[PDB]
Design a protein around this ligand. Structure first.
Ligand code: CHL
Ligand code: CLA
Ligand code: CLA
Ligand code: CLA
Ligand code: CLA
Ligand code: CLA
Ligand code: CLA
Ligand code: CLA
Ligand SMILES: CC1=C[C@H](O)CC(C)(C)[C@H]1/C=C/C(C)=C/C=C/C(C)=C/C=C/C=C(C)/C=C/C=C(C)/C=C/C1=C(C)C[C@H](O)CC1(C)C
Ligand SMILES: CC1=C(/C=C/C(C)=C/C=C/C(C)=C/C=C\C=C(C)\C=C\C=C(C)\C=C\C2=C(C)CCCC2(C)C)C(C)(C)CCC1
Lengths: 49, 49, 154, 498, 49, 215, 93, 144
């Protein structure tokens, strides 16, 4: 019956933890990297207009 | 201790990837996938040890 | 580059920060990256033969110009090691520079030395132009093909 | 007895005036004559530096004084010291190499090489001028050559860039002239413009502040100081790369040289008043330009904003009142003159093959052009303040000069030390990205780009000959600092209690 | 074989490098190679034993 | 086109030890370092020629190891990183065991491998040391030039960078030079009563004197 | 002489060798002079050398002249020349 | 407060009478050198270390490198001058006269060495530096 008590207890959680690299790196993409990109553009805007 | 054991394991993994690249190609998405990698005890014994 | 036909404008936007190479799923690993594309060959040439070929492909100065260009730096190093007066070094360096530049002025002109209008004329006319420029005096050339340098005439 | 500096100043422009006597066509004879003149002049400065310049002397050397106009008490006065010989040698080296790298120019080669020799003469005349009005004249003597070089050999937006450049420089230089008039007329008996007698002048605080502002507006227009930097991105981006050598390696350092020679030396009290406000401006300039650089899709604009960012360390070393800070500022002057010129040269040579501007479409250039990739990576590492290069030791000495400074106490000394540190986090962020958008990845290139496409012997020699002093100074910085450790101390001798 | 030889050397290193921190053939009072190497060494937990 | 792993014999017009002379008929250039030097005709019999080639190879390798182990420690002692090195007196030093029992142990251990080499020379392929991995194919080695995993862990032979004949003549020439060097060192240690590098130092200075004729 | 031994209780003793050495100003001037002569020699030699790309037909044939704006001007020129060729063709016909 | 307003402070006069008798200060002192505040123990350690650094200056003495000798002498001399002032000011009252005498002799040796360097006289520089060397060895022996 592919017991759901086992599927999401470890396998889904462990696989998502290992595949998403612990969710830190994506956060570093979402918070820092893209943000600094936007900041750069904003600074460029203040240097252009 | 860890530097020597780590160099041993990394060089063994590299030799094994080189061995698998002749049957799965040179793509690291295929030549470094342990899902498609079973049963190498018979083929690479020194790397196995 | 240059387009003789107006190119199709980019309808879909592209990420500025993305790598401009091919997609990783379209990458032929081992060939696009030169990782399995060097198979050895018994037919490997000589090391010094390769050195001579690479040196000669650069079109070195030959004769007296080649002699002074080869002997300048060791002479300067020897003069600085032997504690000879440096004024002699400056005199020699200036003489070498002047002699080299005068010899290079004496060398014949090539098609690439002139304006793009002169480069992109008829090839036979350009060949006759280059043959004349290296043969007659500059005053005769200027009084004969002067009007070719008035780029507004045509 | 022999007028060495007068001969050095006069020789390039006088020789370039005779370039119009040549009736030859093409560019071969013209460029070989120009490189002969440039190398002869370089050997002349080498002889002067070798035999008549003493780095242990903190006084003026090889002075020459000829009265030209009696009404202004105005003299053709020339002289070198530890401050000026470095910029003079850098000017000669960079101008000779820019003449060598401007060899594919076949359109109006005569005027191009005449303007190059005129720029040579004008820069050398500025760096060796001991008269205030002579300094102003040599400062003004480059508006026309750079304008013509931009408008006749620039990029797509060359004309607007040239107009903006000449108008901005004139707007700064009128304030420079007002400062010259104010300082040279302060004499109670007769006007005087010699820097030697002006270095002992005493002013009231308000008048000294006004004169400092008048000089500083010009030196902030020329040396890029926020927010008087807007001429630089479009001027350097849309200029010829050979002209970009002089623009980003020599002409930018002239504002810093004027800041040391006039603002730091002649007016020490106003400089002590203005320096803590210059520190914050320099730190914000570093951060602002290092953040503007990722926002530029154009490669040359990114390099120009990188130059603006690198000028902030010079501003910090100026404003930090120590011998170490001034030595670091001079070292950064030399390092940037060695780095920015080569970066602009590589960018121009790469554009001559790829013929693309924006970074988001220049992938895979490392495959047909590996040598230019290697040189670009090495000069980016030099830009990155990597050790073994002059940039790292320059920034480190500037940091030490701030840390050892006695004017500032603790907390600002922290908040500035952290400040430039953020800069050396931001400096990788675009630069490597630039390389990642300019050389990394795979693109299918034409077969004709397989051969006769990479940098030839001339470009390889130019890049190597500018790269070697970078390594030589990053290993042994005292190849430069020992020329100016004494004179800088004299400049600092007026900032302590007496 | 050029890949296999460093693997053999690292196998030997992995087998026989743990005996530089453990005493090799202890007979009574014997200090190992590492503690004799680091004779002045910080040890906060075992500063008296 | 690829990598040739077979020795290429030298052409009959190869340079000789005595130019202008006729090379002997039993020296056809198929051996490493073949310069047609056989005044006494010792290599007339091909079987004895093979045995003498193997003996020359063995003497070459032992002589190169010997001269290296003499010179490099002597060069270290002159620099100062060796306190009391002396190759002549090295045999009479005090070790953890007597020279006789060390000699017997060395005799047993070395007569194992020299005797395995003898069996290989008599019967090529009778003793194989290179592993027989399941699908790896082991190339057949030449007698006196073995080596898979152990003796040739670099794969510098078998046609890699320089062809096998070129590297074999290089080895043989360095070996002959080392044999002459070792015999010279053995005679110098009993004639000059000094070390090798010291003798070189006193010969480089004033070479007109300090020679064989001045002890 | 220029060697200092420090002993610290509970620590291994340290032997420090120091040598305050610096290049003379004459040596620095020699370095500058040799680099200037090397620059002059390289300028002469590598100006006398051939340029693989800037003398090629791939650069000069397209209209290159060493000037940084020849690509855009050539593009606008060929569009204007195409329009003028259409005008010429309509005049002839 | 964030920054100083007036001119930067110059050479602070020593309060242990280790300066010159006529002038009150030493010639080799340089203004603008950053001296870290550690205390008497740190000043003693820096004094010994910089005495060793100045005894590492045999190689720098030559006909071509006298300016660097003078520069290093001024730098280290300012450092050891103020460290000597700090350690004498915190020394016990019984130990102050010998320390002051040793400092006075060392600084007189410094002046003699600088004077010899100024005239570009190499044997005079060597002799003055030998006297300075024995004084510096005495300094490290006292302050070990
Ligand atoms: C195989 C070559 C071999 C050669 C050429 C030499 C050569 C020499 N040995 Mg050595 N030995 C050699 C092997 C061995 N030696 C020794 C043990 C000794 C001793 C105990 C002594 C020498 C000594 C000598 C010198 C004889 C005169 C001479 C330099 C003598 C010496 O003092 O001169 C260096 C000496 O007394 N050798 C042993 C252990 C039994 C060897 C085993 O292979
Ligand atoms: C293989 C090269 C070789 C080399 C480089 C040397 C080097 C040296 N020997 Mg030794 N030597 C050698 C072999 C060699 N020897 C041989 C084979 C023997 C005898 C079997 C000797 C016996 C010997 C004696 C008795 C003495 C030296 C001494 C010396 C010095 C030369 C002066 C002289 O009188 O000796 C010349 C002696 C000979 C017997 C000549 C042998 C030459 C052989 C046959 C051939 C070498 C030639 C060949 C072209 C080598 C290439 C040269 C170079 C590229 C390596 C010099 C440091 C002398 C010494 O140091 O005194 C202070 C001295 O007293 N040697
Ligand atoms: C193995 C020993 C060996 C021996 C004994 C010889 C012997 C000889 N060689 Mg040969 N030679 C050898 C190896 C050898 N060679 C090798 C490996 C090569 C490289 C291919 C040559 C190539 C060669 C050349 C190119 C020449 C000789 C020459 C000579 C002769 C002149 C030597 C002499 O008279 O001065 C005595 C020397 C002392 C230092 C004492 C001599 C008969 C010369 C020739 O044959 O005509 C003269 C000569 O020009 N040889
Ligand atoms: C260790 C012993 C040794 C041996 C077995 C060989 C063997 C061989 N040599 Mg090599 N050779 C050697 C050392 C040796 N060589 C040395 C030291 C040199 C430099 C001088 C050379 C230079 C050389 C050349 C130039 C050539 C050969 C060639 C040959 C081959 C044919 C000749 C022959 O039949 O040899 C039989 C040899 C022996 C059984 C040794 C007999 C020696 C007698 C009994 C006494 C030894 C003499 C004396 C003690 C020397 C002392 C040193 C001297 C400086 C005083 C054969 C493979 C030829 C070739 O084709 O290459 C493959 C050839 O052209 N050899
Ligand atoms: C302990 C027993 C031992 C044994 C059985 C062998 C056996 C052999 N040796 Mg080895 N050898 C030994 C010790 C031994 N060696 C040692 C200790 C050394 C160091 C010096 C050598 C170095 C050596 C050399 C340099 C040579 C041999 C050669 C030979 C062969 C000659 C046969 C013979 O002379 O009888 C034979 C395969 C010869 C050879 O291989 O000829 C083909 C040869 O030239 N051997
Ligand atoms: C050709 C064979 C060879 C032979 C027979 C010898 C023989 C010897 N060596 Mg030498 N040696 C050689 C090559 C050789 N060496 C090489 C290639 C090097 C590297 C440069 C050295 C470097 C060397 C050093 C540094 C020392 C010796 C010493 C010794 C002696 C005893 C040490 C030892 O063997 O057990 C050690 C065995 C182990 C496996 C560990 C002995 C005379 C020792 C000495 O001179 O005695 C006082 C010594 O200090 N050797
Ligand atoms: C002196 C030069 C020399 C040369 C040119 C050759 C040449 C040849 N040999 Mg011979 N050999 C030599 C000395 C030499 N040998 C010695 C002293 C021995 C006795 C140990 C042997 C015994 C031998 C065997 C057992 C085998 C060969 C093989 C070969 C081939 C391999 C290529 C080569 O060796 O690298 C050329 C370059 C070098 C020799 C450079 C010198 C090495 C330096 C001095 C030290 C090595 C560095 C470092 C310490 C090693 C790595 C450290 C690691 C263990 C941690 C080639 C035909 C192989 C064969 O023929 O198969 C086809 C074979 O397996 N050789
Ligand atoms: C006089 C000119 C001369 C010339 C042109 C050569 C030429 C050569 N030598 Mg020889 N050689 C000479 C004298 C000369 N040798 C002398 C005086 C000695 C000392 C006896 C040697 C000993 C020698 C050795 C030891 C080796 C060469 C090697 C080489 C070859 C490799 C080139 C490198 O690169 C080359 C054909 C190499 C070779 O091919 O042998 C393996 C090598 O390793 N030579
Ligand atoms: C006598 C005298 C006298 C006087 O007194 C002085 C004088 C003059 C100095 C002297 C002289 C001398 C001489 C000349 C010598 C020579 C020598 C030699 C040749 C050596 C070699 C030597 C040589 C050697 C060691 C070598 C070795 C080698 C080896 C191990 C190898 C190895 C290997 C192999 C196999 C293979 C693989 O794959 C890789 C490897 C792993 C890498
Ligand atoms: C300031 C000045 C100067 C001077 C300078 C100097 C003083 C220099 C020196 C220098 C030196 C004293 C150096 C030394 C050494 C060096 C080396 C040793 C190098 C090496 C390198 C290599 C080998 C390579 C490299 C490369 C390249 C080229 C590029 C690419 C990358 C690479 C890295 C690969 C001059 C005159 C210019 C003028 C102006 C001013």
């Amino acid at each position: 019956g592919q017991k759901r008590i086992l599927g999401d207890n470890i396998i889904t959680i462990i696989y998502n933890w290992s595949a998403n690299r612990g969710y830190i790196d994506a956060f570093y993409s979402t918070f820092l990297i893209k943000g600094i990109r936007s900041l750069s553009e904003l600074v460029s805007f203040f240097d252009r207009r | 201790t860890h530097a020597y054991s780590k160099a041993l394991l990394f060089l063994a993994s590299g030799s094994l990837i080189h061995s698998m690249g002749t049957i799965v190609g040179y793509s690291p998405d295929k030549s470094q996938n342990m899902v498609l990698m079973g049963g190498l005890t018979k083929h690479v014994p020194i790397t196995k040890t | 580059g240059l387009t003789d036909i107006e190119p199709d404008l980019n309808e879909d936007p592209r990420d500025r920060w993305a790598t401009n190479g091919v997609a990783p799923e379209d990458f032929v690993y081992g060939k696009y990256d030169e990782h399995h594309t060097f198979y050895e060959s018994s037919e490997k040439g000589s090391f010094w033969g390769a050195v001579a070929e690479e040196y000669n492909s650069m079109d070195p100065p030959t004769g007296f110009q080649g002699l002074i260009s080869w002997l300048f730096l060791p002479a300067v190093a020897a003069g600085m090691y032997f504690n000879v007066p440096g004024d002699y070094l400056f005199i020699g360096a200036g003489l070498f520079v002047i002699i080299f530049c005068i010899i290079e002025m004496d060398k014949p002109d090539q098609p690439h030395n002139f304006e793009p209008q002169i480069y992109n004329m008829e090839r036979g006319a350009r060949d006759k132009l280059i043959a004349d420029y290296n043969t007659m005096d500059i005053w005769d050339f200027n009084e004969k093909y002067g009007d070719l340098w008035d780029f507004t005439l045509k | 007895s022999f007028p060495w500096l007068t001969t050095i100043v006069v020789l390039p422009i006088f020789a370039g005036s005779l370039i119009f006597l040549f009736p030859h066509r093409g560019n071969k004879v013209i460029r070989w004559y120009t490189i002969c003149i440039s190398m002869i002049e370089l050997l002349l400065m080498t002889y002067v530096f070798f035999y008549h310049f003493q780095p242990d002397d903190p006084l003026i050397q090889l002075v020459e004084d000829y009265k030209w106009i009696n009404f202004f008490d105005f003299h053709w006065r020339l002289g070198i010291d530890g401050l000026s010989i470095g910029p003079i040698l850098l000017t000669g080296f960079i101008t000779t190499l820019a003449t060598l790298a401007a060899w594919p120019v076949t359109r109006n080669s005569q005027l191009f090489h005449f303007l190059m020799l005129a720029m040579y003469s004008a820069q050398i005349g500025l760096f060796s001028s001991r008269d205030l009005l002579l300094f102003f004249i040599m400062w003004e003597l480059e508006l026309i050559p750079v304008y013509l070089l931009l408008s006749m050999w620039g990029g797509k937006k060359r004309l607007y860039s040239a107009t903006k450049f000449i108008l901005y420089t004139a707007g700064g230089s009128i304030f420079l002239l007002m400062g010259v008039l104010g300082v040279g007329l302060y004499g109670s008996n007769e006007p005087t413009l010699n820097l030697e007698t002006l270095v002992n002048q005493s002013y009231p605080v308000a008048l000294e502040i006004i004169f400092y502002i008048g000089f500083f507006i010009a030196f902030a227009v020329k040396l890029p100081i926020i927010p008087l930097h807007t001429w630089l991105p479009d001027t350097h981006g849309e200029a010829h790369y050979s002209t970009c050598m002089l623009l980003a390696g020599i002409l930018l350092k002239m504002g810093a040289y004027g800041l040391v020679r006039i603002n730091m030396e002649l007016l020490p009290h106003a400089h002590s008043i203005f320096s803590p406000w210059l520190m914050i401006i320099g730190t914000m300039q570093i951060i602002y330009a290092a953040s503007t650089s990722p926002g530029q899709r154009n490669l040359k604009k990114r390099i120009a904003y990188s130059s603006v960012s690198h000028m902030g360390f010079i501003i910090i070393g100026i404003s930090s009142i120590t011998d170490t800070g001034l030595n670091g500022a001079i070292l950064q002057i030399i390092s940037h003159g060695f780095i920015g010129a080569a970066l602009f040269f590589l960018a121009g040579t790469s554009y001559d093959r790829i013929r693309l501007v924006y970074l988001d479409e220049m992938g895979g250039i490392a495959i047909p052009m590996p040598k230019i990739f290697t040189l670009f990576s090495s000069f980016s590492m030099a830009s990155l303040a990597l050790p073994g290069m002059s940039g790292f030791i320059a920034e480190l000495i500037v940091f030490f000069g701030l840390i050892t400074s006695q004017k500032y106490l603790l907390i600002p000394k922290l908040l500035i030390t952290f400040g430039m540190a953020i800069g050396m986090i931001l400096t990788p962020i675009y630069l490597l990205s630039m390389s990642r958008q300019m050389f990394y990845g795979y693109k299918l290139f034409n077969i004709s780009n397989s051969s006769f496409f990479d940098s030839g012997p001339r470009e390889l020699f130019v890049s190597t000959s500018i790269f070697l002093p970078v390594i030589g100074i990053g290993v042994y910085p005292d190849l430069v600092l020992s020329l100016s450790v004494e004179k800088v101390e004299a400049i600092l001798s007026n900032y302590f209690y007496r | 074989n050029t890949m296999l030889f460093p693997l053999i050397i690292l196998i030997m290193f992995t087998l026989f490098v743990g005996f530089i921190g453990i005493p090799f053939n202890q007979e009574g009072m014997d200090l190992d190679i590492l503690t004799k190497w680091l004779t002045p060494s910080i040890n906060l937990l075992h500063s008296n034993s | 086109g690829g990598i040739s792993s077979v020795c290429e014999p030298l052409p009959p017009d190869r340079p000789l030890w005595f130019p202008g002379s006729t090379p002997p008929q039993w020296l056809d250039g198929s051996l490493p370092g073949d310069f047609g030097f056989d005044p006494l005709g010792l290599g007339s019999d091909p079987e004895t020629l093979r045995w003498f080639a193997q003996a020359e190879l063995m003497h070459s390798r032992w002589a190169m190891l010997a001269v290296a182990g003499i010179l490099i420690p002597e060069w270290l002692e002159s620099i100062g990183l060796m306190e009391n090195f002396n190759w002549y007196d090295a045999g009479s030093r005090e070790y953890f065991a007597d020279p006789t029992t060390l000699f017997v142990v060395q005799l047993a251990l070395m007569g194992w491998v020299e005797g395995r080499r003898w069996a290989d020379y008599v019967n090529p392929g009778c003793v194989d040391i290179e592993p027989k991995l399941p699908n790896r194919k082991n190339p057949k080695p030449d007698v006196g030039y073995p080596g898979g995993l152990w003796f040739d862990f670099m794969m510098w032979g078998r046609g890699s960078p320089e062809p096998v004949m070129v590297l074999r003549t290089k080895e043989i020439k360095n070996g002959r030079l080392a044999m002459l060097a070792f015999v010279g060192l053995c005679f110098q240690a009993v004639y000059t009563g000094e070390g090798p590098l010291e003798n070189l130092s006193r010969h480089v200075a004033d070479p007109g004197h300090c020679n064989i004729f001045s002890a | 002489m220029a060697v200092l031994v420090e002993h610290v209780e509970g620590q291994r003793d340290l032997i420090t060798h120091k040598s305050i050495w610096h290049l003379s100003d004459a040596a620095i001037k020699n370095v500058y002079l040799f680099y200037m002569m090397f620059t002059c020699w390289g300028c002469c030699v590598f100006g006398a050398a051939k340029d693989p790309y800037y003398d090629s037909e791939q650069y000069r044939g397209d209209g290159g002249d060493g000037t940084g704006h020849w690509v855009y001007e050539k593009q606008e020129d060929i569009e204007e020349a195409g329009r003028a060729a259409l005008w010429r063709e309509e005049l002839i016909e | 407060q964030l920054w100083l307003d007036g001119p930067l402070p110059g050479l602070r006069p020593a309060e242990n009478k280790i300066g010159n008798e006529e002038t009150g200060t030493r010639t080799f002192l340089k203004k603008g050198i950053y001296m870290a505040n550690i205390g008497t123990k740190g000043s003693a350690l820096r004094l010994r270390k910089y005495a060793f650094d100045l005894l590492a200056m045999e190689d720098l003495i030559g006909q071509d490198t006298l300016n660097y000798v003078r520069r290093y002498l001024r730098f280290k001399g300012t450092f050891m001058y103020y460290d000597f002032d700090k350690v004498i000011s915190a020394a016990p009252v019984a130990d102050k006269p010998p320390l002051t005498n040793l400092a006075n002799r060392l600084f007189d040796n410094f002046e003699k060495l600088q004077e010899a360097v100024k005239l570009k006289d190499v044997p005079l520089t060597r002799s003055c530096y030998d006297d300075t060397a024995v004084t510096l060895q005495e300094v490290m022996n006292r302050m070990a």
